[PDB]
Amino acid sequence: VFHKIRNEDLIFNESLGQGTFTKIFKGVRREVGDYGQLHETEVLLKVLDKAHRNYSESFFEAASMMSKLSHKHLVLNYGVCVCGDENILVQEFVKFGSLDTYLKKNKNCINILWKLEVAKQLAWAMHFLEENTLIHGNVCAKNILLIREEDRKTGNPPFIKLSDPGISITVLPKDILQERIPWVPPECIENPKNLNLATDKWSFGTTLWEICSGGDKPLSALDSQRKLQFYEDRHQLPAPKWAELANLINNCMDYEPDHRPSFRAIIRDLNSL
Numbered sequence: 551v552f553h554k555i556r557n558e559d560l561i562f563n564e565s566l567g568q569g570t571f572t573k574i575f576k577g578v579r580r581e582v583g584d585y586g587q588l589h590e591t592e593v594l595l596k597v598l599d600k601a602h603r604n605y606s607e608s609f610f611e612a613a614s615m616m617s618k619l620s621h622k623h624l625v626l627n628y629g630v631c632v633c634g635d636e637n638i639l640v641q642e643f644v645k646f647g648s649l650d651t652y653l654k655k656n657k658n659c660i661n662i663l664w665k666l667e668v669a670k671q672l673a674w675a676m677h678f679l680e681e682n683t684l685i686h687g688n689v690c691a692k693n694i695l696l697i698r699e700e701d702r703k704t705g706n707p708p709f710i711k712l713s714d715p716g717i718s719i720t721v722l723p724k725d726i727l728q729e730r731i732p733w734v735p736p737e738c739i740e741n742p743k744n745l746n747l748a749t750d751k752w753s754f755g756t757t758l759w760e761i762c763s764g765g766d767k768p769l770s771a772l773d774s775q776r777k778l779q780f781y782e783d784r785h786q787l788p789a790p791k792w793a794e795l796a797n798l799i800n801n802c803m804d805y806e807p808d809h810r811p812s813f814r815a816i817i818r819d820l821n822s823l
């Protein structure tokens with residue numbers, strides 16, 4: 551169950567770009583808050599076309615399932631507005647945006663402990679999802695949102711949240727799945743119905759590679775045909791520039807899904823670094 555938000559209470563201010571068959575906007579929600587105060591809340595609006603009915607159902611099913619969980623590292627959805635010709639997810643606006651963009655804009659001037667802190671937080675979110683037997687299916691650095699920057703005076707680390715899952719790879723066109731190599735694991739390129747909790751362990755490895763590579767995209771030089779051949783020849787990503795997490799990345803990106811470590815074990819490994 552998603553809280554319903556009246557169309558009249560949503561103002562669209564900025565058109566920010568596109569996700570996978572979504573249009574993204576910054577806006578404001580006029581709402582009655584705690585103690586009955588009228589608030590104008592910055593919101594991020596994910597807009598789906600109603601005509602793409604199967605995409606929409608997958609998208610909002612995923613959003614709702616995960617929003618039934620409350621967790622400090624999972625993005626907050628405020629509700630939905632389906633009172634248009636479009637279905638709108640109304641989400642918290644995370645001030646510092648996507649982690650890959652953030653790393654690029656800061657020219658990768660962040661230390662290894664910052665990266666490990668973010669990795670630990672993402673792993674904590676993924677362990678929570680794993681304990682709930684809930685597959686995310688779209689773990690990547692762009693879906694890691696930075697709530698706050700490190701504060702060296704207070705000793706407070708960066709703090710992240712993981713985005714909603716979006717449309718499932720079980721319904722997306724094959725060409726999209728291939729473009730998402732190497733986040734989409736090899737068994738899912740073989741058959742998108744092989745989606746499993748193990749999927750997210752593989753994608754977590756790819757995401758760690760991104761975090762350690764300053765927001766570079768792995769295999770960016772390879773077109774889809776060559777990405778498919780990269781999996782065919784069972785190749786691994788190059789060791790990232792910060793190589794401290796190279797071993798963990800390879801252990802997560804195991805071509806045998808059953809051999810990928812649990813998030814409890816991933817957290818232990820991160821703790822020991």
Ligand SMILES: C=CC(=O)N[C@H]1CC[C@H](c2ccc(F)c(C(=O)n3nc(Nc4ccc(S(N)(=O)=O)cc4)nc3N)c2F)CC1
Nearest residue numbers: 566567568574594641642643644645646647648692693713
């Ligand atoms: C046209 C160029 C282009 O690629 N645009 C991209 C398109 C994909 C967008 C995206 C990706 C993944 C996400 F998880 C979110 C998301 O869920 N987000 N992002 C935010 N915060 C935020 C968003 C945008 C900016 S921005 N544009 O002003 O720099 C600053 C802060 N808050 C929440 N909840 C999201 F919006 C980001 C802009």
